[PDB]
Design a protein around this ligand. Structure first.
Ligand SMILES: [Mg+2]
Ligand SMILES: [Mg+2]
Lengths: 229, 138, 101, 84, 132
């Protein structure tokens, strides 16, 4: 149980203070990464680790917030807590250039975008993307699988909550320049054109769909034909 | 819409050491194609004006090296094929620029030197008299 | 894998001439002055004459590097007239063209 | 209405008076330290975005000539002076 | 009669490219050079070495992309960079072209000790200038 594990760890940390050993970033990042299992039980203990880093002088890295983001982003209703954890994390990170300090620094942006889609907050998603575009922060997006997941959740949230005139500007800026879309984003885009009563663009989405490898997707061709007819 | 928010600027450090002074930079480019030198001249001159460097341009006389070879593999001495290499020149003459300005301009125009074009940049540096030479020991 | 045995002999002559260049230069310096005694220069004559024959640089021949043709070679490209023309006539030699004037 | 950064700490550790003032310059590069430094170069590992970044990469790797061109780049004659 | 680099007339059925259709006297008049470097300019050195490298690169690419080259190579040298520009066909799968580009750029960079880049332009079929 958490209480037993949380008592041993505090004993290792106190031993580390008896032996005149100073903790580094990975010491606190390991605690937060290991508390992921306990979820709700570790939510407040995990926030005690973060506040300790600030006081001691260790600077939270992108991984420090990725681990806190994943700990609080448990299946359930995120509005109760996850809402104000991500809003405070971004106010802290606003306009900060990041350097590689932890191996898990390339996972924050994928994690942060995953909550913006869940909360359906487009203002927060722009702040997350704004942080990715400051300085050289774009290099922390992650491998190709993380790059495509980030942009899928990002664009699917634009099509849903953004005006269609702006949505079609992101569609041009991101695809194929930034990532190649999954067939479910082509569908999410058609659903946005329908809601906007702009169906003269459907023939273009089919032309683009073929150019992205969705010529023979059944769910897509049925979606296009049903809206047209 | 997907534009960078803030851009990291390369770090340029102002030193405590004084800068070099160049009375003249004579950039002589050589090529086989006059039109390529015309385009490079336009690029190099426009680059100098934007950076505030005083630049003059002229075209030294071209050099054509010709040589003769036998046409046949065997005998037929009186039948030859003649070849030539044409070297055309353009000379950019820059004046009154510091060593830091010369490093930026030369790096910018040397990196953009077209394929097939060589550059000979003669730099004339201004120096003061060595202290030992100011007065005779004798 | 050189073009022929004659190119292979010149390769060895160029390798041996390179290995003995410093030694031959130093001995020759003793022979190419009127300052040292003849008794010393006569010994230097014998010493350079005893070096391997293929260390002598006059035996190096400028052969075509692609065909080993010993004559008709253009030094700048190290090619025979035939090989040079083949490349030049196909536009593969930068800046080289037929000359009319 | 309460920020997360305000609340209870753990209090097990204490504020560093200052960061380490004298570094271990001659610390050996153990396999554990050399490998961890490779995990920190993978988090910012991304494909080249354009042709300028390829030149920058080649220049750092030493493949591309440094500009402006210096015909003596990488050749000092053993630090010899003219009088030698 | 002159023979050098002259595609002789046939019965009007032999497709030739623009390069193949122009005899040597049209070099620098109607057709440019297939390699551009500074070695053949007046007062420049190392023309012999640049020429051997070009002959190798043309043979290397012919046998490395067998049946794929639709025209002669264009070789460009800037600084220590070597750029190989080739017009290829659209028969090989794209995966094989990426393998061969990665392989060739790497192998040639280590062979000649310079950064080498390969630029491929694909055409559906050999471009025909005229039928001789
Ligand atoms: Mg005749
Ligand atoms: Mg001889």
């Amino acid at each position: 149980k958490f209480e037993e594990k949380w008592s041993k760890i505090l004993e290792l940390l106190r031993h580390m203070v008896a032996q005149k050993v100073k903790p580094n970033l990975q010491t606190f990042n390991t605690i937060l990464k290991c508390l992921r299992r306990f979820h709700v039980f570790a939510r407040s203990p995990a926030l005690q680790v973060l506040r300790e880093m600030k006081a001691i002088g260790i600077e939270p890295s992108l991984a420090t917030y990725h681990h806190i983001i994943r700990l609080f982003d448990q299946p359930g209703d995120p509005l109760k807590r996850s809402s104000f954890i991500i809003y405070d994390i971004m106010n802290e990170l606003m306009g900060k250039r990041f350097s590689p300090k932890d191996p898990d620094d390339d996972k924050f942006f994928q994690s942060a975008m995953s909550i913006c889609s869940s909360l359906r907050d487009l203002e927060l998603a722009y702040q997350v993307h704004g942080l990715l575009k400051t300085g050289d922060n774009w290099k922390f997006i992650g491998p190709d699988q993380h790059r495509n997941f980030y942009y899928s959740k990002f664009f699917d949230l634009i099509c849903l909550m953004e005006q269609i005139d702006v949505t079609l500007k992101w569609y041009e800026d991101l695809i194929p320049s930034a990532y190649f879309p999954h067939s479910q984003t082509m569908i999410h885009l058609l659903q946005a054109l329908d809601v906007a009563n702009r169906l003269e663009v459907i023939p273009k989405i089919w032309k683009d769909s073929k150019e992205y490898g969705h010529t023979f997707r059944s769910d897509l061709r049925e979606e296009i034909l049903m809206l047209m007819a | 819409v997907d534009v960078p928010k803030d851009l990291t600027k390369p770090v340029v450090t102002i030193s405590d050491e004084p800068d070099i002074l160049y009375k003249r930079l004579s950039v002589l480019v050589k090529g086989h194609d006059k039109a390529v030198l015309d385009s490079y001249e336009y690029f190099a001159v426009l680059a100098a004006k934007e950076l505030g460097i005083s630049i003059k341009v002229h075209e030294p006389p071209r050099k054509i090296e010709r040589f003769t070879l036998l046409q046949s593999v065997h005998i037929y001495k009186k039948h030859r094929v003649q070849y030539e290499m044409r070297t055309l020149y353009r000379c950019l003459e820059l004046e009154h620029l510091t060593g830091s300005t010369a490093d930026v301009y030369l790096e910018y125009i040397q990196r953009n030197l077209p394929e097939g074009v060589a550059m000979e940049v003669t730099k004339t540096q201004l120096e003061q008299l060595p202290e030992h030479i100011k007065e005779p020991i004798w | 894998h050189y073009v022929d045995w004659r190119m292979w002999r010149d390769v060895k002559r160029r390798k041996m001439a390179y290995e003995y260049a410093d030694e031959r230069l130093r001995i020759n310096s003793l022979r190419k002055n009127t300052i040292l005694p003849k008794i010393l220069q006569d010994v230097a004559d014998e010493e350079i004459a005893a070096l391997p024959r293929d260390s002598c640089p006059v035996r190096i021949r400028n052969r075509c590097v692609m065909t080993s043709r010993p004559r008709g070679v253009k030094r700048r490209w190290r090619l025979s007239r035939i090989v040079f023309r083949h490349l030049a006539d196909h536009g593969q030699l930068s800046g080289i063209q037929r000359a009319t004037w | 209405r309460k920020n997360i950064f305000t609340g209870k700490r753990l209090n097990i550790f204490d504020m560093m008076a200052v960061t380490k003032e004298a570094p271990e310059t001659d610390t050996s590069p153990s396999l554990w330290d050399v490998e961890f430094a490779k995990q920190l170069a993978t988090v910012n590992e991304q494909p080249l975005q354009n042709g300028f970044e390829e030149l920058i990469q080649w220049t750092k790797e030493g493949k591309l000539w440094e500009f402006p061109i210096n015909n003596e780049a990488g050749f000092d004659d053993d630090g010899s002076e003219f009088h030698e | 009669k002159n023979r050098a680099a002259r595609v002789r007339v046939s019965k009007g059925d032999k497709p030739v490219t623009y390069e193949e259709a122009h005899a040597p006297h049209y070099i620098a008049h109607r057709k440019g050079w297939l390699s551009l470097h500074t070695g053949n300019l007046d007062g420049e050195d190392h023309a012999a070495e640049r020429t051997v490298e070009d002959v190798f690169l043309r043979k290397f690419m012919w046998g490395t992309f067998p049946g794929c080259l639709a025209d002669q190579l264009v070789l460009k040298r800037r600084g220590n960079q070597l750029e190989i520009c080739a017009v290829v066909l659209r028969q090989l799968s794209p995966h094989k072209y990426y393998f061969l580009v990665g392989y060739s750029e790497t192998l040639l960079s280590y062979f000649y000790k310079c950064p080498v880049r390969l630029h491929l332009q694909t055409v559906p079929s050999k471009v025909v200038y005229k039928y001789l």
